[PDB]
Amino acid sequence: VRGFYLRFGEGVSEEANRRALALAEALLRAPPPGLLDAVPAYGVLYLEYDPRRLSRGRLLRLLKGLRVVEIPVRYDGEDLPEVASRLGLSLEAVKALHQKPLYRVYALGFTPGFPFLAEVEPALRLPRKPHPRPRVPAHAVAVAGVQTGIYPLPSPGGWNLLGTSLVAVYDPHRETPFLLRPGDRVRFLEAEGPTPPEPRPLELLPEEPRLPALLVEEPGLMDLVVDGGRFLGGHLGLARSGPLDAPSARLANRLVGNGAGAPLLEFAYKGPVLTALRDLVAAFAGYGFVALLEGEEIPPGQSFLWPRGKTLRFRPRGPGVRGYLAVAGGLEVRPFLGSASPDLRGRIGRPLWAGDVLGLEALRPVRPGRAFPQRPLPEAFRLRLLPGPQEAFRALCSGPFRVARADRVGVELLGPEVPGGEGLSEPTPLGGVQVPPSGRPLVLLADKGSLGGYAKPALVDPRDLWLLGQARPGVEIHFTS
Incomplete structure (x- = not known):
């Protein structure tokens, strides 16, 4: 099972995003047998597929000729005053600025149903926090630079919290689980009412x-x-x-x-x-x-x-x-x-x-x-590496790592220092080796999040991913090309 990206323009660009989103919908509306996923996010579209059933050439030639949602919001975010004073605006200004644009969903699913919306008005653009909260509460409406988002469920986050959505964007019990879908337009408006419950x-x-x-x-x-x-x-x-x-x-x-x-x-x-x-x-x-x-x-x-x-x-x-x-x-x-x-x-x-x-x-x-x-489970796992979407290889293959934490989401490794990085969120690949700027490397498994910001220099060969399913804290891992 291979997987590859199609990139149409760097950064948060409306044109590049429309292009990526367009192709994604064309595939999802009529998916050829063998397509596992088509995930758009800003200028990038990620396609995961089975080469046994679907060839890459077939998939590419398909592409060659391939809704406004109101969000009521109570503007009582914990960062609202801070954001106001940091930007040299009043509370009223930030609320007005935030409500002005008709946003659009550039990416969806950091957690299920979580929309990344843009564009925030220049006067309201403000960088993320240095340290993120370990728990941002559900339904939080926050901003970071040119973006704004809605937390459908609790998760960590360093975005500037401005208010609370009075409607739950994600709810799997509901007749229509996802309120927002990729490409949808969103208008925020100030409202009064109870915080909606978590599903x-x-x-x-x-x-x-x-x-x-x-x-x-x-x-x-x-x-x-x-x-x-x-x-x-x-x-x-x-x-x-x-x-x-x-x-x-x-x-x-x-x-x-x-x-x-x-x-x-x-x-x-x-x-x-x-x-x-x-x-x-x-x-x-x-x-x-x-x-x-x-x-x-x-x-x-x-x-x-x-x-x-x-x-x-x-x-x-x-x-x-x-x-x-x-x-x-x-x-x-x-x-x-x-x-x-x-x-x-x-x-x-x-x-x-x-x-x-x-x-x-x-x-x-x-x-x-x-x-x-x-097949017997070998004492030490000799995992194979493939080139990721992002020098780094050498760092990984240099010596033995050790499994720190390990679950269905991923296997956390400690060992030789490996150079990482970060940028806009892009779809997380199959068996990707995620290397943050400062943090332990993390091999991503079946329950990984769809989108990720940290760099992915390498991928673990999909024929070796099963070993990491039997990874235990302490088990030694060796990487090779």
Whole structure:
């Protein structure tokens, strides 16, 4: 799975952005099979695709011949006085200036539904903060230089906070989840009223499934049901998601006769405790755990009969941190925008709870006892690097790094100093190695944010991204060309 950019003009340019947005819509309105994402942001359009199904030449030749929204706002931002005095204006002036232009969405989805709007009037243009707040509250309306934005949900931020949107831009429970879409025009107007609530997570599995399969006795650390992933959502800020270690997910399903993206269960560090509500055939793959069905150990990479009333358990036996459980027929799921995978940033899906009842989608007649020798998890990960959209290579390949933090969003590395940078947000590539100006390098994974400001000198080869799905704090990593 390759991915590439088409750039039409540097900086925040209306013409260049119209050009990028135009092509994005042309593809999204009629997506050729093989297109994974088309994400516009200012003068840049990012295209992610499968070369098996869709060639780059095909995709390029397609491109060769390829709404005003009111935002009511209470202007009581914590920075409003500061911004006024810093710019030599009154409160009234900043409020008038901010309401004047008909803005437009140059980029969308720093978090799901988060619009980057421009242009702010010259007199109101003011640089970002030196240090960002770790938590900017939901619905905050802030400005930074030529831009203005709306925080659909809580996140960190150093933009100058001017007020609060009296309408929630993002809400997945709503009939139309995203109030704003790329290219839309926005007018702000001063209003009075309550701050709207944050949406709470949208559940992707039915509470009472039609074919109860297993009861969650005890939950693991974070058990997430996942399918192939969510596609053609990056332009809204929706993550690809899916299994963090795809090869293992596939094996688990493959063994129980399921398709490629049959909803299965991913768990990390601590697995769940599950009791079959009926006779099942399931399979366990992944690393870090050993399965135990009523005492008897079940090694990973083989399917097995799971009788009614018996309890399955997972016991750590490392290294590796992430394991998958697949059941014959797949799990029943209510999909959101085409996928059962979660986006915990966008509050789509949730970790399994105690008392949850998962169900079969279909009654697939399969015989248990299929087995396949899983590729072993190597002691040290020798990850391959590809050229990123941004000298830097040498820094990464020079020596051994060590995994500090590591989750579904990305793997944080500490080791040799690597030169970074920052600019306008652009769509985050597949397996990109993100290097800030001053900060640890961060390899971005399935739950990464759609847009990113920090430089991406390299990409991890997509055939090596599974290793980072089994990354544990302390694991050593070596980069090579």
